[PDB]
Amino acid sequence: PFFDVQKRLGLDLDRWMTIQSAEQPHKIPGRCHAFEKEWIECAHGIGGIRAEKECKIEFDDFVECLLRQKTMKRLSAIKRQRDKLIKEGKYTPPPHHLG
Amino acid sequence: PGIVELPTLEDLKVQEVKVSSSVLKAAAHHYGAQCDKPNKEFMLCRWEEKDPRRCLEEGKLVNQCALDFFRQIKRHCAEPFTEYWTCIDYSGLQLFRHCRKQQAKFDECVLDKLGWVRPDLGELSKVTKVKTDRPLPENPYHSRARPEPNPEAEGDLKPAKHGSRLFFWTM
Amino acid sequence: MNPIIYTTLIMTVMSGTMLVMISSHWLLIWIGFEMNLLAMIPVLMKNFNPRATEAATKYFLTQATASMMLMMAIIINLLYSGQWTITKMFNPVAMTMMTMALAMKLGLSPFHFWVPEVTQGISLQAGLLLLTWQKLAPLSVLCQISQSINPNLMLTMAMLSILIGGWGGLNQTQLRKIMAYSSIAHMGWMTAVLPYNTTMTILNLLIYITMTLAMFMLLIHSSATTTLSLSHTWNKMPVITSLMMVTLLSMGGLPPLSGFMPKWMIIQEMTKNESIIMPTLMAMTALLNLYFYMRLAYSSSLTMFPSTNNMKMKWQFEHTKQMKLLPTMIVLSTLVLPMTPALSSLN
Amino acid sequence: MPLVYMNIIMAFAIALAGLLMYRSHLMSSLLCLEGMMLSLFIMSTLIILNTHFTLANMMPIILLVFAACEAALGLSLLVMVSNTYGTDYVQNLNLLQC
Amino acid sequence: MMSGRPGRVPLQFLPNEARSLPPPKLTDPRLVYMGFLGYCSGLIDNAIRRRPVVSAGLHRQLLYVTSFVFFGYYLLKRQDYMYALRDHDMFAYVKSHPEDFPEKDKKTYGEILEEFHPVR
Amino acid sequence: AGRIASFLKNAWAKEPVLVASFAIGGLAIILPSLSPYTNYAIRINRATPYNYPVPLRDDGNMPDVPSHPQDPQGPSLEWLKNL
Amino acid sequence: KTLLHKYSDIPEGTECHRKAYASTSIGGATGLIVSAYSIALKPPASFLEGVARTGRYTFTSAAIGAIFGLTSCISAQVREKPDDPLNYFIGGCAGGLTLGARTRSYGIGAAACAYMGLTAALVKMGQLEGWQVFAEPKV
Amino acid sequence: MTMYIAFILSTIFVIGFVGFSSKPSPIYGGLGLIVSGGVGCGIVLNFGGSFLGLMVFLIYLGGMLVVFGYTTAMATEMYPEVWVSNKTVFGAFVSGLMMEFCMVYYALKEEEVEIIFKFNGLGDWVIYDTGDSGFFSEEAMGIAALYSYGTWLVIVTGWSLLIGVVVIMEITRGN
Amino acid sequence: MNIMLTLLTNVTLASLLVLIAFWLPMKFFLVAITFLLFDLEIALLLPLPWASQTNNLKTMLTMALFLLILLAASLAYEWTQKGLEWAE
Amino acid sequence: IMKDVPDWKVGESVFHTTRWVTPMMGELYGLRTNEEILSATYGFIWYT
Ligand SMILES: CCCCCCCCCCCCCCCCCC(=O)OC[C@H](COP(=O)(O)OCCN)OC(=O)CCCCCCCCCCCCCCCCC
Ligand SMILES: CCCCCCCCCCCCCCCCCC(=O)OC[C@H](COP(=O)(O)OCCN)OC(=O)CCCCCCCCCCCCCCCCC
Ligand SMILES: CCCCCCCCCCCCCCCCCC(=O)O[C@@H](COC(=O)CCCCCCCCCCCCCCC)COP(=O)(O)OC[C@H](O)CO
Structure with a gap:
């Protein structure tokens, strides 16, 4: 906050939902709660400019959990190279693939 | 980065409990x-x-003890079970409310025939400890080393040397 | 309006910006911007004249659109980090998105054509509120996220304000139009220094705020909206025109008046940041502002202008409004240069 | 990233272009401004529901209840320029030339 | 810059560390300047309201001078505190980062060859 | 007093819907405060296991937590049973 | 800024054809921006007048870029001065004279020579040196 | 097909935006948004979010947009342009068509669309997570916190709506 | 799917039997805007049923009733300052 | 399937951590026929 009356008065108005690892109704996880716990707990008391450097590995994983860019891009390589093998008959699917 | 370890299909093969939902819930x-x-x-x-x-091994024992539980009741009054779980099945939400007499039929073997007892409300929801063997994991989250916090300020807050030091302002 | 109902509209917007400067959550910041807009519209149309109806429509469409652009800047940052807190932004296009979105709420770059028309339509009393309080809310967010700002992105916005504010100000006739262009020119000064050190951004804001109230409430006392109408006030109220001249010199920036407060430190600050061509252009093009300050100064007090016979009747009656805080606002905007090292208090 | 989000993202952009370009009528511009917050609503719900950010479900309901407040203000201003000028055409709204 | 240094209790116009500074003397040249501004405020206040300038409600002048000096005096305390704070945390970083501020070596002007460009 | 009572009487004479609304809204705001079952409502609200009762590592020295689900130790909702 | 990178990557004077094409590309792109604004803030009568405004503005700007890049490069290796700001000084006036003929006024041509000639030397002036117009916030 | 149903709906969602972004007659523009509003809920519905989706029908489509076209009904000129009318309106419509066709074609062949945001072109379904939700709906239990965690939200959004009621009269009063 | 099938079948039946019937043979604004603001305020307390089962329903009681008195407050100000007594 | 592809470490870790990340359905079902994908993802949502 520009004027952090939040901290001075010691009463919460907005930080409850600011992160998904905070308190949740009936204790349900926010999908990537495990990863962002590591990143935030990496970044406390480190400073903004420092934390972006050292806590980069934690942030990259947390983005990959949240954003899920490369994981399905790799899965794209799974499917694209799959149909580019079945179409010429080079690959046959085992029977657990169907039922 | 690196291979993700996956348990083999051999030990993965485990006797799966071959019963439906109604029999489980009843x-x-x-x-x-x-x-x-x-x-x-x-x-x-x-x-x-x-x-x-x-904990895949403990998962096998969870099933394994389930077969033992179902085995003992199989030797016991299985016919009342067939009556009990069929009427439970005939409920869209599997409500225990409708099935009361057949529920009593099942309950009145296990209390004396099997020596069991129907758990009242609350005990099954009780938070209970368990005496185990597996030690506490060193870090379940697989946390890495923390960055060293910057050193904090220390020393008496001395007056600013030679005033404001902003252009010609002497003090 | 009903005095009690105009009061809450005056200070619902007081609270709307108050939320922005204290909210640590991105959504809540938009909430304060919403009440900022929701309470600004009625005040602009207190008098209900077609100028105000146009001015409200132009103001609403601009601010609403900027607010919407701000939201997707919030969403994209959420989409890429899942963080609702206000910190440095974690994605480039989101950073680029809100800089323009926040700019349009403030209005410095080509997103400034609304500023002259809206203040021209609306009354002078609501003019100061639009030109003074409605700039802290966008600036508070910008000072907050200044770390992630794009240095190229902001600075070109900064000059285009001062060059446009400097150039078009010469041709303006209506005093509200001149005041608006100077506000655009002044807006460029602290926005340029914003990426380097926000302390001077706040320092420029405070001084500029003090100068603008001194300008607006004196004009309210003059009851004049045109240069010729302001020119006549030399005879009825010669003292006001003399004070009109000193604040014009101050808000021009000539030393040792308080207009040399922001520029000098801003010039010094960027010079420490190796940006030296940048200050020279702004300091030199600031003279464009001084020219129509001189033009107003010449017609107000330095040379008396022809008056009308009917205004002998004006001398027969005293003023009514007490124009609260006018004496302290003028002095706090002319002779505060020797108190320059007080800027350390802000940081 | 899933093409449904890029479908939403252009939906903002085409809505953004319509709001900025203008043709004749402020009704259409107000309509274009509503597609803005609309596409924002699905985009907000889509991310928030996908990530199971339970408290963040706050924002979708909060988003449009305040976006609808623009309609409460925007619609009112239109009828006034409609009462005075006649048709609410943007070309009519040019009195503040100076 | 400040802003978020370790220990930043918000909306604190005078943090407790400021009590360890020499308080601004009442005869401070900066402090009396606040008093001078208060007088100028009083003169304008009578001038704007068509009052007999100096001898026109001296009670208002007293209030203006008192407010400016009092509001001034607390300002210098914060002004001196932040200025002292800037140098304090400064003087410790150089110790913690000595290789970041290497000390020069003694070389008198007798060995330094400053080129002499003739002037005509 | 007299005027206030007459004010209510003429309020009921010509405006009976609003006095019904204000009375109901007036009550509906103050019995929940001094209600004796409000705490009961909270008690049964927390006594609804949406989330699993995750077990705790038995390190001893804690007798309150039952070792067995059917064990007498631990909380009970016998109050919920009769009410 | 790949378009701006073209001019910087090609050595001064050498490869005059590449410098000329890159320089007029910069001018043409700049002409597009100003012409687009001109139609926006001040609409013409119809579309045919709109492209007419674009045609004039783009042709002027492209001409300034073409003549500046050509003169700057052709003066560098001819004089064997790959660093002297004068290599851009006559370039600025080359654009300045080019603008003057484009709007057909001697007075504006001389002023454009003086102003562009100074700025072109100044733009070169910073290229040899470390002058930054958008310096990053080091402090 | 059925796997791309969210993609199918998302495609109708985009072309629905071109319907009203082209700025046709205000009634017809509203209709173009009405369908666009309708399909957008289905996109939300396919992701869960029943309550959040249902509002788009109720308080926006059957809500905000009802009074929207209602205002267009008693306002506007006596000659409402039919969608074809001005060649610009149809030019805008076909313009919207070529943007969605080029990206979708680019999306389904190379899957490496980088326009502004780099987005990989896979099916809608490769983004869903996994896990059981127990006996509580995630959406339902989230916005039900309006009165358990939504403290500062309710205080501010309620206050502004009251100011919303007062601002609308003050503008519509006519002084 | 079933939901889509149901709505699709309804449209065709309406479309089919329409075709056989075609080939074989400020006050007005104020009521709109006041409804709009009340309707938006109504959407706030729609999640009330599940919200009534929160574990801190005491805070729910203060604030769920809060919105309802504001509904009354918005109408009360509307009523007293003419408002629902539409222009006539 | 990717023995032939030049550069591919079989079972390459996606996240830098060695902790078990919950495996999203995309890698789970994936290869499965569209009937399995259709019934398992939009199964709860379309069940009525
Ligand atoms: C930084 C550089 C300078 C910047 C400022 C420059 C200002 C002037 C620039 C030119 C201005 C335009 C041209 C002239 C405009 C004149 C305006 C005007 O109103 O003039 C006429 C007017 C007539 O005077 P009148 O209002 O009747 O009041 C007389 C005193 N009762 O005159 C007035 O109203 C003026 C009244 C002045 C009153 C002065 C009072 C002085 C009091 C001195 C007190 C000293 C105490 C010493 C204490 C010592 C111990 C501590
Ligand atoms: C080595 C790298 C560079 C190599 C190439 C050389 C530099 C680029 C080319 C020259 C750019 C600057 C010269 C001006 C170009 C634009 C000219 C233009 O717009 O002309 C049209 C018009 C002038 O005529 P007008 O006043 O309209 O009167 C006739 C009306 N019928 O215009 C106007 O009326 C408005 C005034 C002109 C437009 C605004 C200013 C445009 C130029 C800004 C600086 C551009 C710098 C480019 C290079 C650095 C950045 C890449
Ligand atoms: C009426 C117009 C002007 C009239 C004549 C006035 C005097 C002519 C020259 C004006 C000089 C203005 C800029 C000088 C400010 C201080 C600059 C200085 O001390 O020298 C620096 C010179 O550096 C500069 O680039 C300064 C600016 C040079 C000139 C460009 C801007 C001024 C000209 C345009 C603006 C003024 C003209 C009017 C335009 C309308 C040294 O820094 P450096 O470059 O060595 O930095 C270290 C390293 O190399 C990284 O750079």
């Missing part, structure tokens, strides 16, 4: 009340290890 109270320690061991392992592959 005897759920007695099943939870009697064979519960292996469930608690596996339940604690899943929340502490946070890694499913670490």
Whole structure:
């Protein structure tokens, strides 16, 4: 906050939902709660400019959990190279693939 | 970065309990009340290890004790069970409310024939400890080393040297 | 309006910006911007004249659109980090998105054509509120996220304000139009220094705020909206025109008046940041502002202008409004240069 | 990233272009401004529901209840320029030339 | 810059560390300047309201001078505190980062060859 | 007093819908405060296991937590049973 | 800024054809921006007048870029001065004279020579040196 | 097909925006948004979010947009342009068509669309997570916190709506 | 799917039997805007049923009733300052 | 399937951590026929 009356008065108005690892109704996880716990707990008391450097590995994983860019891009390589093998008959699917 | 370890399909092959939902829910109270320690061991392992592959063995025992529970009742009044779980099946939401007499029929063998007891409301929801063997994981989250916090300020807050030091302002 | 109902509209917007400067959550910041807009519209149309109806429509469409652009800047940052807190932004296009979105709420770059028309339509009393309080809310967010700002992105916005504010100000006739262009020119000064050190951004804001109230409430006392109408006030109220001249010199920036407060430190600050061509252009093009300050100064007090016979009747009656805080606002905007090292208090 | 989000993202952009370009009528511009917050609503719900950010479900309901407040203000201003000028055409709204 | 240094209790116009500074003397040249501004405020206040300038409600002048000096005096305390704070945390970083501020070596002007460009 | 009572009487004479609304809204705001079952409503609200009762590592020295689900130790909702 | 990178990558004077094409590309792109604004803030009568405004503005700007890049490069290696700001000084006036003929006024042509000639030397002036117009916030 | 149903709906969602972004007659523009509003809920519905989706029908489509076209009904000129009318309106419509066709074609062949945001072109379904939700709906239990965690939200959004009621009269009063 | 099938079948039946019937043979604004603001305020307390089962329903009681008195407050100000007595 | 592809470490870790990340359905079902994908993802949502 520009004027952090939040901290001075010691009463919460907005930080409850600011992160998904905070308190949740009936204790349900926010999908990537495990990863962002590591990143935030990496970044406390480190400073903004420092934390972006050292806590980069934690942030990259947390983005990959949240954003899920490369994981399905790799899965794209799974499917694209799959149909580019079945179409010429080079690959046959085992029977657990169907039922 | 690197291979992700996956348990082989060999030890993965485990006797799966081949019963439906109605039979499970009808005897759920007695099943939870009697064979519960292996469930608690596996339940604690899943929340502490946070890694499913670490506690797969305890998962087998969770099923294994389930077969033992179903085996004992099979030797006992299986016919009242067939009556009990069929009427439970005939409920869209599987409500225990409709099935009361057949529920009593099942309950009145196990109390004396099997020596069991229907758990009242609350005991199955009680938060209970479990005496286990597996030690506490060193760091279940697999946390890495923390960055060193910047050193904090120390020393008496001395006056600014030679005033404001902003252009010609002497003080 | 009903005095009690105009009061809450005056200070619902007081609270709307108050939320922005204290909110640590991105959504809540938009909430304060919403009440900022929701309470600004009625005040602009207190008098209900077609100028105000146009001015409200132009103001609403601009601010609403900027607010919407701000939201997707919030969403994209959420989409790429899942963080609702206000910190440095974690994605480039989101950073680029809100800089323009926040700019349009403030209005410095080509997103400034609304500023002259809206203040021209609306009354002078609501003019100061639009030109003074409605700039802290966008600036508070910008000072907050200044770390992630794009240095190229902001600075070109900064000059295009001062060059446009400097150039078009010469041709303006209506005093509100001149005041608006100077506000655009002044807006460029602290926005340029914003990426380097926000302390001077706040320092420029405070001084500029003090100068603008001194300008607006004196004009309210003059009851004049045109240069010729302001020119006549030399005879009825010669003292006001003399004070009109000193604040014009101050808000021009000539030393040792308080207009040399922001520029000098801003010039010094960027010079420490190796940006030296940048200050020279702004300091030199600031003279464009001084020219129509001189033009107003010449017609107000330095040379008396022809008056009308009917205004002998004006001398027969005293003023009514007490124009609260006018004496302290003038002095706090002319002779505060020797108190320059007080800027350390802000940081 | 899933093409449904890029479908939403252009939906903002085409809505953004319509709001900025203008043709004749402020009704259409107000309509274009509503597609803005609309596409924002699905985009907000889509991310928030996908990530199971339970408290963040706050924002979708909060988003449009305040976006609808623009309609409460925007619609009102239109009828006034409609009462005075006649048709609410943007070309009519040019009195503040100076 | 400040802003978020370790220990930043918000909306604190005078943090407790400021009590360890020499308080601004009442005869401070900066402090009396606040008093001078208060007088100028009083003169304008009578001038704007068509009052007999100097001898026109001296009670208002007293209030203006008192407010400016009092509001001034607390300002210098914060002004001196932040200025002292800037140098304090400064003087410790150089110790913690000595290789970041290497000390020069003694070389008198007798050995330094400053080129002499003739002037005509 | 007299005027206030007459004010209510003429309020009921010509405006009976609003006095019904204000009375109901007036009550509906103050019985929940001094209600004796409000704490009961909270008690049964927390006594609804949406989330699993995750077990705790038995390190001893804690007698309150039951070792067995059917064990007498631990909380009970016998109050919920009769009410 | 790949378009701006073209001019910087090609050595001064050498490869005059590449410098000329890159320089007029910069001018043409700049002409597009100003012409687009001109139609926006001040609409013409119809579309045919709109492209007419674009045609004039783009042709002027492209001409300034073409003549500046050509003169700057052709003066560099001819004089064997790959660093002297004068290599851009006559370039600025080359654009300045080019603008003057484009709008057909001697007075504006001389002023454009003086102003562009100074700025072109100044733009070169910073290229040899470390002058930054958008310096990053080091402090 | 059925796997791309969210993609199918998302495609109708985009072309629905071109319907009203082209700025046709205000009634017809509203209709183009009405369908666009309708399909957008289905996109939300396919992701869960029943309550959040249902509002788009109720308080926006049957809500905000009802009074929207209602205002267009008693306002506007006596000659409402039919969608074809001005060649610009149809030019805008076909213009919207070529943007969605080029990206979708680019999306389904190379899957490496980088326009502004780099987005990989896979099916809608490769983004869903996994896990059981127990006995509580995630959406339902989230916005039900309006009165358990939504403290500062309710205080501010309620206050502004009251100011919303007062601002609308003050502008519509006519002084 | 079933939901889509149901709505699709309804449209065709309406479309089919329409075709056989075609080939074989400020006050007005104020009521709109006041409804709009009340309707938006109504959407706030729609999640009330599940919200009534929160574990801190005491805070729910203060604030769920809060919105309802504001509904009354918005109408009360509307009523007293003419408002629902539409222009006539 | 990717023995032939030049550069591919079989079972390459996606996240830098060695902790078990919950495996999203995309890698789970994936290869499965569209009937399995259709019934398992939008199964709860379309069940009525
Ligand atoms: C930084 C550089 C300078 C910047 C400022 C420059 C200002 C002037 C620039 C030119 C201005 C335009 C041209 C002239 C405009 C004149 C305006 C005007 O109103 O003039 C006429 C007017 C007539 O005077 P009148 O209002 O009747 O009041 C007389 C005193 N009762 O005159 C007035 O109203 C003026 C009244 C002045 C009153 C002065 C009072 C002085 C009091 C001195 C007190 C000293 C105490 C010493 C204490 C010592 C111990 C501590
Ligand atoms: C080595 C790298 C560079 C190599 C190439 C050389 C530099 C680029 C080319 C020259 C750019 C600057 C010269 C001006 C170009 C634009 C000219 C233009 O717009 O002309 C049209 C018009 C002038 O005529 P007008 O006043 O309209 O009167 C006739 C009306 N019928 O215009 C106007 O009326 C408005 C005034 C002109 C437009 C605004 C200013 C445009 C130029 C800004 C600086 C551009 C710098 C480019 C290079 C650095 C950045 C890449
Ligand atoms: C009426 C117009 C002007 C009239 C004549 C006035 C005097 C002519 C020259 C004006 C000089 C203005 C800029 C001088 C400010 C201080 C600059 C200085 O001390 O020298 C620096 C010179 O550096 C500069 O680039 C300063 C600016 C040079 C000139 C460009 C801007 C001024 C000209 C345009 C603006 C003024 C003209 C009017 C335009 C309308 C040294 O820094 P450096 O470059 O060595 O930095 C270290 C390292 O190399 C990284 O750079």
